[PDB]
Amino acid sequence: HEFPKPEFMSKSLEELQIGTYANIAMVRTTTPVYVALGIFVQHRVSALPVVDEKGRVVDIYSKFDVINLAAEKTYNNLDVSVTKALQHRSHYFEGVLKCYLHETLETIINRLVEAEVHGLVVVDENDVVKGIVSLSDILQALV
Amino acid sequence: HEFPKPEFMSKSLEELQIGTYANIAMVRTTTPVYVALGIFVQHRVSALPVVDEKGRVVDIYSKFDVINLAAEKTYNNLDVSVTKALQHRSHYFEGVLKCYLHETLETIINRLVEAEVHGLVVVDENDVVKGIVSLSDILQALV
Numbered sequence: 001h002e003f004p005k006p007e008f009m010s011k012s013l014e015e016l017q018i019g020t021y022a023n024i025a026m027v028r029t030t031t032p033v034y035v036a037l038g039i040f041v042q043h044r045v046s047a048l049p050v051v052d053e054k055g056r057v058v059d060i061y062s063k064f065d066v067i068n069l070a071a072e073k074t075y076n077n078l079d080v081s082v083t084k085a086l087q088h089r090s091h092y093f094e095g096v097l098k099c100y101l102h103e104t105l106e107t108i109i110n111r112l113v114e115a116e117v118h119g120l121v122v123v124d125e126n127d128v129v130k131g132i133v134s135l136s137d138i139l140q141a142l143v
Numbered sequence: 144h145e146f147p148k149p150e151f152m153s154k155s156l157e158e159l160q161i162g163t164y165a166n167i168a169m170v171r172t173t174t175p176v177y178v179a180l181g182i183f184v185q186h187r188v189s190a191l192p193v194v195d196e197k198g199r200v201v202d203i204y205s206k207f208d209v210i211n212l213a214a215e216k217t218y219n220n221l222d223v224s225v226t227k228a229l230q231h232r233s234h235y236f237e238g239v240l241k242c243y244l245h246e247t248l249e250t251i252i253n254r255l256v257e258a259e260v261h262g263l264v265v266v267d268e269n270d271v272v273k274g275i276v277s278l279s280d281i282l283q284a285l286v
């Protein structure tokens with residue numbers, strides 16, 4: 001009974017209707033961590049696209065990023081920028097940040113597993129946010 | 144304004160009232176992945192304690208575990224056991240599986256960051272499930 005089904009691994013994100021494409025919560029490179037933490041606790045979404053001055057995705061900020069900040073032995077306050085998370089990892093340069101609607105479920109799954117990341121930002125031709133794909137969305141496709 | 148606050152890093156899980164201690168969804172070492180996947184998609188919890196024949200915690204099964212299974216190049220079906228996830232990692236032997244109510248937030252945070260894990264099972268003296276602590280619970284303590 002193969003897991004995952006080969007006929008669904010070969011279908012695109014668009015075809016499978018996988019991800020969230022409305023009401024996306026996101027932040028800027030100039031956003032302090034206190035704003036992200038407020039979003040996580042009060043708005044309750046799992047990952048935040050981080051966009052530069054042009055609206056282009058340059059990182060994804062997760063709840064684990066906050067915990068990583070909290071564990072730092074150097075002195076921090078919450079007025080630190082979300083871009084300080086980049087000292088621990090670069091989702092961007094490892095090619096495990098973004099994805100496209102036309103990409104296959106197999107491609108997306110291989111990308112998640114590549115860096116052990118829980119989410120990808122769906123972008124357009126200008127790297128501008130269209131949606132988000134998280135492990136929950138993939139699990140709905142895997143059923 | 145220090146992040147995290149030192150006066151809350153020194154407090155225990157019990158003292159901070161961090162974690163979920165009722166209505167815990169969990170599975171057995173004999174549980175097939177199809178049962179875990181159904182739980183994730185329909186019951187909608189982030190991590191499942193995996194308990195042996197004696198009710199003792201021997202693993203934690205996460206949504207990423209399913210994605211990891213899905214990416215395997217060898218042939219699988221969903222009748223595989225949740226214990227096949229153990230081929231990718233041992234939360235147990237790395238000491239990043241369990242925690243106790245009396246442990247400090249700083250200890251718990253350092254443990255999460257140690258293996259880059261998103262959750263811990265709160266256990267008793269017999270390694271039996273008392274609750275679960277996930278990144279969301281920690282974020283509520285960090286505010």
Ligand SMILES: Nc1ncnc2c1ncn2[C@@H]1O[C@H](COP(=O)(O)O)[C@@H](O)[C@H]1O
Binds near residue numbers: 024026048049136137
């Ligand atoms: N920043 C976000 N804004 C809006 N929806 C999101 C965001 N991050 C994740 N989601 C969606 O939240 C749902 C649950 O995802 P998760 O919280 O990872 O289980 C999924 O459908 C995601 O696509």
Ligand SMILES: Nc1ncnc2c1ncn2[C@@H]1O[C@H](COP(=O)(O)O)[C@@H](O)[C@H]1O
Binds near residue numbers: 275
């Ligand atoms: N297996 C589980 N059974 C019950 N509650 C859970 C389980 N896993 C996580 N939770 C709780 O679900 C809430 C949201 O956690 P998370 O889904 O990781 O954001 C937290 O209060 C967790 O303690």
